[PDB]
Specification:
The protein is mainly β. The chain is built from 1 helix and 3 strands; from the N terminus they run E-E-E-H. A hairpin with a 5-residue loop joins strand 2 and strand 3 (40-45). The chain starts with 18 loop residues before the first strand and ends with a helix. It binds one RNA strand of 81 nucleotides through strand 1, strand 2 and strand 3.
RNA sequence: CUUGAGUCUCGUAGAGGGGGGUAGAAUUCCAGGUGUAGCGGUGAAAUGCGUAGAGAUCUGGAGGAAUACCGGUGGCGAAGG
């Protein structure tokens, strides 16, 4: 038996479609993609994307 | 005496008052789903909120307060309003 592949041969969902809900808040920005029924599938933030209080409120921090 | 003053007829606009009712919108709160480690507050944060499952997103339920637009040096009330 040889060594295994570098990248996965299979993937557990393929839901194709969703809605990005943004709460661009006065001190931060929070972005969440949810399926069309509003059950959330995955998310990320300004402040969690490597910015503290002083930077997390900017469109450049939100862009990331 | 009718001219001041008063009165009815009649035309008429009004967020004027008191009593009651109502629709939708929203901030909040509760439950639960989905999801997953972030959230928050300031000049900076700190205090504070999270993984005992937050934030964000969906749906059910709950409360109490107030009427966005219209809106104008506009209209109405003795003034307070």
């Amino acid at each position: 038996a040889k060594a295994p592949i570098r990248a996965r041969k299979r993937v557990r969902k393929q839901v194709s479609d969703g809605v990005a809900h943004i709460h661009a808040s006065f001190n931060n920005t929070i972005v969440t993609i949810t399926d069309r029924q509003g059950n959330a599938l995955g998310w990320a933030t300004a402040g969690g994307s490597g910015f503290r209080g002083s930077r997390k409120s900017t469109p450049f921090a939100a862009q990331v």
